[PDB]
Amino acid sequence: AALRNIWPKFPKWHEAPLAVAWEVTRFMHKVDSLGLKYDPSTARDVTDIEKPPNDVFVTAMTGNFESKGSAVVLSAVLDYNPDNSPLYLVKLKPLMFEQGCRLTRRFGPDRFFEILIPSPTSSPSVPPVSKQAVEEVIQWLTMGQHSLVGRQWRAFFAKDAGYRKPPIIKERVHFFAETGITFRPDEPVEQRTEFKVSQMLDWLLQLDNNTWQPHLKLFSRIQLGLSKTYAIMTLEPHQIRHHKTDLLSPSGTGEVMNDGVGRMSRSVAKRIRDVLGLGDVPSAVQGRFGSAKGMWVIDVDDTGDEDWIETYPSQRKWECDFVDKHQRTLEVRSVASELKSAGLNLQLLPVLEDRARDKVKMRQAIGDRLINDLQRQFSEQKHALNRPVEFRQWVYESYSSRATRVSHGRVPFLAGLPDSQEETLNFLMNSGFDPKKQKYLQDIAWDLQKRKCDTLKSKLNIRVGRSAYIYMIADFWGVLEENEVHVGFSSKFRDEESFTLLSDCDVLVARSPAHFPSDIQRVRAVFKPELHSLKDVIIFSTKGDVPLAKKLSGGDYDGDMAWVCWDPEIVDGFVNAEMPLEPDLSRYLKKDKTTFKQLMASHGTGSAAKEQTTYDMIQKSFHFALQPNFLGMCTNYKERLCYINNSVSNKPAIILSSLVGNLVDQSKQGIVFNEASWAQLRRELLGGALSLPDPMYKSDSWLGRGEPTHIIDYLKFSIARPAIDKELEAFHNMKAADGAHFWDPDLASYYTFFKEISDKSRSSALLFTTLKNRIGEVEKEYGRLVKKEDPYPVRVNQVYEKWCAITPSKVIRLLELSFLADREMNTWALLRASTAFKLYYHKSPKFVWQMAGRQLAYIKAQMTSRPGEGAPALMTAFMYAGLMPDKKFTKQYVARL
Amino acid sequence: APVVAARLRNIWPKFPKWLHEAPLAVAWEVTRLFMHCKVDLEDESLGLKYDPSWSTARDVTDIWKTLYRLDAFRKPFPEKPPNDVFVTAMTGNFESKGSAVVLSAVLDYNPDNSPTAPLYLVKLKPLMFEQGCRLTRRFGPDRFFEILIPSPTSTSPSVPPVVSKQGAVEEVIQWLTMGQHSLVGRQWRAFFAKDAGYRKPLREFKPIIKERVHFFAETGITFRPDEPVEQRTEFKVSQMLDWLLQLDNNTWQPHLKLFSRIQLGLSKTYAIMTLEPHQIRHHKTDLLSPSGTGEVMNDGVGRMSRSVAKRIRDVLGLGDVPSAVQGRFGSAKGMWVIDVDDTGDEDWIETYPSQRKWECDFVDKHQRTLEVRSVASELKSAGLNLQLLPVLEDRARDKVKMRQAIGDRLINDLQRQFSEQKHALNRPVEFRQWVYESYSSRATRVSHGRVPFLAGLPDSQEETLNFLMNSGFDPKKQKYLQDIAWDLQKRKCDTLKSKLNIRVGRSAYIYMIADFWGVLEENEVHVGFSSKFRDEEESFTLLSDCDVLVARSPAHFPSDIQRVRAVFKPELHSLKDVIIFSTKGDVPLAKKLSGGDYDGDMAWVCWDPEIVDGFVNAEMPLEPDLSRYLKKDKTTFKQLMASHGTGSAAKEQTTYDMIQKSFHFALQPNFLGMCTNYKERLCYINNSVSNKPAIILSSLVGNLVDQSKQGIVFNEASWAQLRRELLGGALSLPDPMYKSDSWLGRGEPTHIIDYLKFSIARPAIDKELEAFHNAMAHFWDPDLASYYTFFKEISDKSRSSALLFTTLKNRIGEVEKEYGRLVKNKEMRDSKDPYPVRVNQVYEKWCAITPSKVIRLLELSFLADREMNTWALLRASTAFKLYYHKSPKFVWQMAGRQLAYIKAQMTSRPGEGAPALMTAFMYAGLMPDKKFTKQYVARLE
DNA sequence: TACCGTCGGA
RNA sequence: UCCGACG
DNA sequence: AACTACCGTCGG
RNA sequence: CGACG
Ligand SMILES: [Ca+2]
Ligand SMILES: [Ca+2]
Ligand SMILES: [Ca+2]
Ligand SMILES: [Ca+2]
Ligand SMILES: [Mg+2]
Ligand SMILES: [Mg+2]
């Protein structure tokens, strides 16, 4: 309680633009009758007054916190303050641009403030102040306004942000600015009318027509207003087709067959392409529209050019009138785009094996694939090392630097070589060095492969080229039969056969996470020309008793993606399983069903009652949301117990699958599940208080007895590790080495050159001896500071600074080339590198290459040039970074040779 | 004409006794030098003897160096064979990885008209690689020799009199075919000839029609009477042809048609695999029309097993398995498509009668080897051409509409291609990406193992643009780079206004195939792509539920473009990058397309709705009977043999008769060109491709393309008579106005081509070039003068340095003046020395400019490539200082390389990254990263 | 004054 | 442009 | 002390 | 880290 002054105080020193106030307050970095005064508001860069970029600042000052659909964000991080004298330390983050949302577009980003705060229901770090208290924290966040940068902030939403480092579990809480110093009673940022959270929520959800909803679920729908989305277009009432019924089963079971998905007209789809700047028209988008959320797919039957969209009951999360423009605006979160290979995750393996007709054969196949994959990998690197052009291509494919190059506009350099080992190899190879000839490169290439082996031991990867995660859609047009799916691609899906569609074959579909044996299903891919224009989506039938998506771990067509696999080896043994009869767990899982109406009865009728009920929902929902979550604990418990049983289909496996199936829906479903319910369910149905071990596959080595038997144990320890160990032993054998050597007669060329001049001139000899000596001093400082585990980059740079200081008559002017702004590009730099190489190449080779790699590459390129054999090119750092190896050149050139 | 016969006795270079020991590659390349340097190979004054070193040479320069020691050879050496070729000729038995070493010569008429002078001058070409063929694989590339020779029936004014005024044609033909020709130790006998078109005479020795003639080496000094290239067995041309054609079983064929099938043995192909007899299904009947017309519906195409397709992918290194290949297999020629019904794993192929061009037993393994000429591969956008436009207008439901559209399309296509280059020009990273996507240099880079240079810059203008931007030059700040981009665009505009190749995004040229499986109804076609076919608005992986136009070039009849319905059949989904026509109906759709079929024909396929939707199909034309003018010589091989009798001697004589008779037939003047041009002019002046004269001439040229294969005789008199009796007289029509570069007509253009070129293309091109010229910069760049400044300051305080600096200055103007004479002089534009040779001579003079510690420090003599020393930097800088405005082309072409070096040196900034000095080879293996260009620009904006 | 279209430069 | 195939 | 916190998809 | 299921 005495939680009475957590936020920074606002002084009357109170007329500053909101952006100016927050950035000035950001002083916190820490000064509390000094003559502080309001300097003369029109700044366009923060430096003029951990830094907000100017573009953000201009939009904050002049753009009303909005630009290109991006909103400036008032985000803050709160962490427990160490001192425990009679709580949190606020750290207002820099102003940043984040994608906007319905609520910020309708009321203004400046009126929204988001914080990351430690959960009060959490852990040793939690201060004793643990001895209380949660009600007091929740009251602090909800019951009252919060003053900050001259605005009164009220809380209206909370969501789990997960474990965060000050590690503890932190909540994201959202606040709305209801009033302020610049605010007006009953629009620019400064001239803002005062609006209560209760009205802001009533605008979004139209509570008067939704009091029948469980308030917990209603509260969860607030997330639609905060969904970060691209505003595409606004549609007119006569352009919106609200259906009053979903597509239902033809078998009369009553099941909804298009849960979450509707059609849009082809023109609407075109506007999406135009607004988002997309190479083609998207077949389907994940979006929001009024109360509706889910997927929209092009009506392949739309021949006109008129804009329209439909909604369905399964999509509309609350009764909406769709009157306000912002409730009629199509909002896209993502579009169905070109697919990539998915591989096979380990959760799928137990179910795949559980459903195999021949478990021994299915195991044998997965293992033979992995052995074939690892053997290919090891063999390809060995072949690549033989030729620089081939090794450059392999080194480029193993690690991606484009992100690092784009952010820097160049390959970043530490001292005389690029930061990364893979860039050091390519850079040095581009200058003519050979890994099989220059030991320095040989060693580097040895590290990377040795580190690559260590990455394989840690993580088991079964990669299947013929798999992909794909948005799921339902078949509005009735062309697909119950067990048929349609899959066409927007481009070539490449597997070392290639595909543009799937036709006349079986496929597996699943959703991750898969738990029940039926959470994977085998189906027949049939390409229907009627659907040819829908690409990068998989289309399920709308016939049959139950929608196929429902079978995929309770899936639907509202944004769900399916794992789709058409690898014939993985598919052919699979035997479908009926959906499981889920046990009754109500003894352990209590559902709070209280409706908004029931909440209101406590207060009466009319605006005053409704507003009270609304702030009630918020506080109660905050309590629920802050209750410790057990999804992860129970998921891990299931993994450990199913491992022990080697079963995913027996009685405890179904129980745990049903349990975790309800723990994901916890916020929307109002499911209560505390520590005591977990202890009771374990005691009565599982292994009681016993703490379960971790599966053996969770460590790098087989620490068990006898040969591994669990499929994941078998693949990681009986297939993968022995193969990896065989390559490592081959690599360890190195000892064997007509070999790679540090010495390169090319790199001493400048040294020998200047030695001949020095022998005939005393004046030049003195400069040479000085140079030789100063280099010696720096090599001793490298031994001192580099060979000292303050940080390693800093220490290398420290020597590099001393190295670059080694500086030098027509001879001096020709050596120094003063007109060059970058002294590392003059002839003295070459000479220094050559002389250092000559004197320290065998004693201390890393010093020479780390200090002078850059110039050694220059010397090498110069020396290996041959008259009339083409021209070496001197690339600028920027232009060098934008180039990549040409895969076709390597294959074509290698074939010729 | 025995005066011609006199000048036809010492045409080939003599093979001296001192070179008999030489391997053929030696004899060839040694002979080439003697011929190029004007030294007599039997000159006794030189004391010539075989150098034993030549037998082990791995570089031709090593052999020629020995000759250049002699004073007689000390003129620039002739173009040299690449080293891998030469080694292959010396130790590889003339074959490497499916490539054959080729022996070729070019002949031109001797300008000397002495009665005793050689009629022709010979230039042996350097050994080279070309793809092999069945005949070179079966008998060895070293036994084949091909020449280009002037056609003795040429009527050009340039023909000497000894032939033009004389029995000369009969004497030349007899020279070619009567007996063996001695050359490099071997006896060569002609066995095939084909038209090689109009060729300019070599400068070393007015276009003339030349023939390509192929000789087989029947024997030679090292040959053995009845393998390595040197130990070869005697073999007669008559026998080699019998091996190819199995003449005993083909005497029923017209001998001229039989002769034309020799091309199948010479077709350049990749040998894939050899199938066993039991894997080969010879069909006795083609797929026939279901309506009983007898018409063949799969003319030239058959099925292969899925495993055969896989082997093709493997052997050729393809990304995926190709649905269809163009190939040869024994006597069969045509297309083979994967059997979509094949689920086994057994190798097999099938042949049809329409594919088999002679009766072949398929016993020999070389007659059982699938050979691939080409595969159906990823498609690209096509465009219109001058032949389609009049037919598209003829068939248009609204001529005025289509006319106005085609034009407005040309206009918008020009605007997008100018607007994309103008945006890209604003940032160097973006222009580089645009230049890289503009052209393809991968092929050249892979062959030379680097970017080839001419003097101080890459040869390509595209490579030069990127090479100089890679060193930091901006194309909006340096005029030399702007000028290069300008010239490049002009050239493309010139091509548009000359060829009117209007781009149509939704169009492609696609191999045609027939539907073996009966799923396509008549007038339905199936098109699936192997990957996304992009068009700015829409992208495609297949075509479904739309109308398409299909056509073949040459298109002449109104019905040579056909509008049909694209229907995607899931049964055929695995056949990609081909267009499949129906095998139902009375006539195969392929036949309607200028008489086409499925043996390698490609169709122009258009699915652009604005172009498709106005088109109205025409019915097939009522063709005239032209037998009065086109006379087919149908003489069979059997009939030829009756002149001689039966048995092996008779057959051998008949075979050589076929050859000589077919040479005479092949050397007769061809009228395809004249009659096609006549049709163009007539249809132009009438502005009609559908009236009676248009149909007659379309039917005529339709017959003359088939000429050599059909035995059609059509002489000058018959052309005249044909024009007289059917076409209103033997006239000489005006050239269309669009043949000229500016509008020479009166008033507004009337013909659609005139309209598009002169009303649309020309004004728009001048408009774009006006706005492109306004969206763009100086020659000067202070950075490039940094070294020049640096050294004036030194040489302002040193007399010795100043003397050096002045000699450099003076000698640069010396070479500059030489550049203005050899390259700049418009007079030198035509000279025996071509542009590259003239540049190099100036470059050599430039590189000859050459510099005590200051000299050592400038020279860096330990560097093997003096062009990388600091001197080369000072030289380029000074030259730039002096001539950046007066002679920009000179500075950049001589010193561009070092200028690039100085620029990258000067623009480097401390701690702002490191410039990278790439090796020439490593530089050529890199390509722009499109994903980097887009990611970086987005961060910038 | 004697053709056009598709590919490729081993 | 030149050279080499092909339709 | 010692129990004990999930999978997948895209982007950055 | 940032969204999303
Ligand atoms: Ca869902
Ligand atoms: Ca749902
Ligand atoms: Ca043909
Ligand atoms: Ca044919
Ligand atoms: Mg659901
Ligand atoms: Mg034909």
Side-chain angles (χ1 to χ4, degrees), chain B residues 529-536 539-541:
Chain B
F529 304 114
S530 68
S531 184
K532 192 206 284 181
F533 191 104
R534 299 210 28 91
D535 188 33
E536 249 206 328
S539 289
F540 314 82
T541 65

PDB file of all heavy atoms in Angstrom, chain B residues 529-541, unseen atoms left out:
ATOM      1  N   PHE B 529       2.506 -24.505 -65.688  1.00  0.00           N
ATOM      2  CA  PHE B 529       3.871 -24.025 -65.595  1.00  0.00           C
ATOM      3  C   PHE B 529       4.618 -24.778 -64.504  1.00  0.00           C
ATOM      4  O   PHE B 529       4.012 -25.398 -63.629  1.00  0.00           O
ATOM      5  CB  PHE B 529       3.889 -22.524 -65.328  1.00  0.00           C
ATOM      6  CG  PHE B 529       3.136 -21.725 -66.364  1.00  0.00           C
ATOM      7  CD1 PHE B 529       1.984 -21.035 -66.032  1.00  0.00           C
ATOM      8  CD2 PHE B 529       3.579 -21.684 -67.682  1.00  0.00           C
ATOM      9  CE1 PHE B 529       1.285 -20.301 -66.998  1.00  0.00           C
ATOM     10  CE2 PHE B 529       2.899 -20.950 -68.644  1.00  0.00           C
ATOM     11  CZ  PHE B 529       1.742 -20.254 -68.299  1.00  0.00           C
ATOM     12  N   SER B 530       5.959 -24.736 -64.580  1.00  0.00           N
ATOM     13  CA  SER B 530       6.786 -25.363 -63.551  1.00  0.00           C
ATOM     14  C   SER B 530       6.983 -24.459 -62.346  1.00  0.00           C
ATOM     15  O   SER B 530       7.312 -24.956 -61.264  1.00  0.00           O
ATOM     16  CB  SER B 530       8.148 -25.784 -64.124  1.00  0.00           C
ATOM     17  OG  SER B 530       8.946 -24.666 -64.475  1.00  0.00           O
ATOM     18  N   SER B 531       6.814 -23.148 -62.509  1.00  0.00           N
ATOM     19  CA  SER B 531       6.841 -22.215 -61.391  1.00  0.00           C
ATOM     20  C   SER B 531       5.966 -21.017 -61.724  1.00  0.00           C
ATOM     21  O   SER B 531       5.365 -20.947 -62.791  1.00  0.00           O
ATOM     22  CB  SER B 531       8.257 -21.752 -61.053  1.00  0.00           C
ATOM     23  OG  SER B 531       8.232 -20.924 -59.895  1.00  0.00           O
ATOM     24  N   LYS B 532       5.896 -20.073 -60.794  1.00  0.00           N
ATOM     25  CA  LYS B 532       5.072 -18.890 -60.979  1.00  0.00           C
ATOM     26  C   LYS B 532       5.505 -18.133 -62.234  1.00  0.00           C
ATOM     27  O   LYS B 532       6.657 -17.715 -62.354  1.00  0.00           O
ATOM     28  CB  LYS B 532       5.180 -17.990 -59.755  1.00  0.00           C
ATOM     29  CG  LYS B 532       4.164 -16.883 -59.704  1.00  0.00           C
ATOM     30  CD  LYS B 532       4.669 -15.698 -58.899  1.00  0.00           C
ATOM     31  CE  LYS B 532       4.615 -15.960 -57.416  1.00  0.00           C
ATOM     32  NZ  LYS B 532       5.103 -14.760 -56.685  1.00  0.00           N
ATOM     33  N   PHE B 533       4.588 -17.985 -63.174  1.00  0.00           N
ATOM     34  CA  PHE B 533       4.779 -17.124 -64.332  1.00  0.00           C
ATOM     35  C   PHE B 533       4.253 -15.743 -63.955  1.00  0.00           C
ATOM     36  O   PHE B 533       3.042 -15.561 -63.798  1.00  0.00           O
ATOM     37  CB  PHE B 533       4.035 -17.701 -65.533  1.00  0.00           C
ATOM     38  CG  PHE B 533       4.367 -17.036 -66.830  1.00  0.00           C
ATOM     39  CD1 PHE B 533       5.202 -17.662 -67.743  1.00  0.00           C
ATOM     40  CD2 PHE B 533       3.849 -15.782 -67.140  1.00  0.00           C
ATOM     41  CE1 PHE B 533       5.503 -17.062 -68.942  1.00  0.00           C
ATOM     42  CE2 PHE B 533       4.156 -15.176 -68.347  1.00  0.00           C
ATOM     43  CZ  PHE B 533       4.968 -15.817 -69.245  1.00  0.00           C
ATOM     44  N   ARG B 534       5.152 -14.771 -63.803  1.00  0.00           N
ATOM     45  CA  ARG B 534       4.782 -13.461 -63.275  1.00  0.00           C
ATOM     46  C   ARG B 534       4.325 -12.513 -64.376  1.00  0.00           C
ATOM     47  O   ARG B 534       4.922 -12.459 -65.453  1.00  0.00           O
ATOM     48  CB  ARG B 534       5.960 -12.826 -62.534  1.00  0.00           C
ATOM     49  CG  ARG B 534       6.440 -13.629 -61.336  1.00  0.00           C
ATOM     50  CD  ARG B 534       7.013 -12.720 -60.264  1.00  0.00           C
ATOM     51  NE  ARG B 534       6.396 -11.395 -60.304  1.00  0.00           N
ATOM     52  CZ  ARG B 534       5.321 -11.027 -59.617  1.00  0.00           C
ATOM     53  NH1 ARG B 534       4.710 -11.855 -58.780  1.00  0.00           N
ATOM     54  NH2 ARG B 534       4.849  -9.791 -59.767  1.00  0.00           N
ATOM     55  N   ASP B 535       3.265 -11.762 -64.088  1.00  0.00           N
ATOM     56  CA  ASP B 535       2.879 -10.570 -64.834  1.00  0.00           C
ATOM     57  C   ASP B 535       2.496  -9.502 -63.815  1.00  0.00           C
ATOM     58  O   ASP B 535       1.980  -9.833 -62.744  1.00  0.00           O
ATOM     59  CB  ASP B 535       1.728 -10.875 -65.798  1.00  0.00           C
ATOM     60  CG  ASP B 535       1.422  -9.731 -66.738  1.00  0.00           C
ATOM     61  OD1 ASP B 535       2.346  -8.983 -67.135  1.00  0.00           O
ATOM     62  OD2 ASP B 535       0.233  -9.595 -67.093  1.00  0.00           O
ATOM     63  N   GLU B 536       2.769  -8.230 -64.125  1.00  0.00           N
ATOM     64  CA  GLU B 536       2.698  -7.187 -63.099  1.00  0.00           C
ATOM     65  C   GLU B 536       1.449  -7.302 -62.226  1.00  0.00           C
ATOM     66  O   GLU B 536       1.537  -7.294 -60.992  1.00  0.00           O
ATOM     67  CB  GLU B 536       2.774  -5.799 -63.741  1.00  0.00           C
ATOM     68  CG  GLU B 536       4.072  -5.049 -63.440  1.00  0.00           C
ATOM     69  CD  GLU B 536       3.917  -3.532 -63.502  1.00  0.00           C
ATOM     70  OE1 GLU B 536       3.097  -3.042 -64.306  1.00  0.00           O
ATOM     71  OE2 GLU B 536       4.625  -2.829 -62.749  1.00  0.00           O
ATOM     72  N   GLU B 537       0.276  -7.430 -62.847  1.00  0.00           N
ATOM     73  CA  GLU B 537      -0.965  -7.540 -62.084  1.00  0.00           C
ATOM     74  C   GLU B 537      -1.147  -8.941 -61.493  1.00  0.00           C
ATOM     75  O   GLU B 537      -1.236  -9.108 -60.268  1.00  0.00           O
ATOM     76  N   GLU B 538      -1.190  -9.958 -62.356  1.00  0.00           N
ATOM     77  CA  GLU B 538      -1.557 -11.318 -61.995  1.00  0.00           C
ATOM     78  C   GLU B 538      -0.385 -12.264 -62.227  1.00  0.00           C
ATOM     79  O   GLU B 538       0.439 -12.047 -63.120  1.00  0.00           O
ATOM     80  CB  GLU B 538      -2.780 -11.774 -62.819  1.00  0.00           C
ATOM     81  N   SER B 539      -0.309 -13.321 -61.418  1.00  0.00           N
ATOM     82  CA  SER B 539       0.662 -14.385 -61.634  1.00  0.00           C
ATOM     83  C   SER B 539      -0.061 -15.713 -61.819  1.00  0.00           C
ATOM     84  O   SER B 539      -1.217 -15.875 -61.424  1.00  0.00           O
ATOM     85  CB  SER B 539       1.667 -14.468 -60.488  1.00  0.00           C
ATOM     86  OG  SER B 539       2.526 -13.344 -60.559  1.00  0.00           O
ATOM     87  N   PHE B 540       0.635 -16.659 -62.448  1.00  0.00           N
ATOM     88  CA  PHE B 540       0.021 -17.884 -62.936  1.00  0.00           C
ATOM     89  C   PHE B 540       0.941 -19.066 -62.683  1.00  0.00           C
ATOM     90  O   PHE B 540       2.161 -18.968 -62.855  1.00  0.00           O
ATOM     91  CB  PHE B 540      -0.294 -17.839 -64.458  1.00  0.00           C
ATOM     92  CG  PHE B 540      -0.965 -16.583 -64.924  1.00  0.00           C
ATOM     93  CD1 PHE B 540      -0.232 -15.447 -65.202  1.00  0.00           C
ATOM     94  CD2 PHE B 540      -2.338 -16.549 -65.112  1.00  0.00           C
ATOM     95  CE1 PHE B 540      -0.853 -14.297 -65.643  1.00  0.00           C
ATOM     96  CE2 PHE B 540      -2.966 -15.404 -65.560  1.00  0.00           C
ATOM     97  CZ  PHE B 540      -2.224 -14.272 -65.820  1.00  0.00           C
ATOM     98  N   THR B 541       0.348 -20.191 -62.289  1.00  0.00           N
ATOM     99  CA  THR B 541       1.038 -21.470 -62.329  1.00  0.00           C
ATOM    100  C   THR B 541       0.415 -22.403 -63.347  1.00  0.00           C
ATOM    101  O   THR B 541       1.012 -23.433 -63.667  1.00  0.00           O
ATOM    102  CB  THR B 541       1.022 -22.129 -60.940  1.00  0.00           C
ATOM    103  OG1 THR B 541      -0.332 -22.450 -60.588  1.00  0.00           O
ATOM    104  CG2 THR B 541       1.622 -21.182 -59.883  1.00  0.00           C
TER     105      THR B 541
END
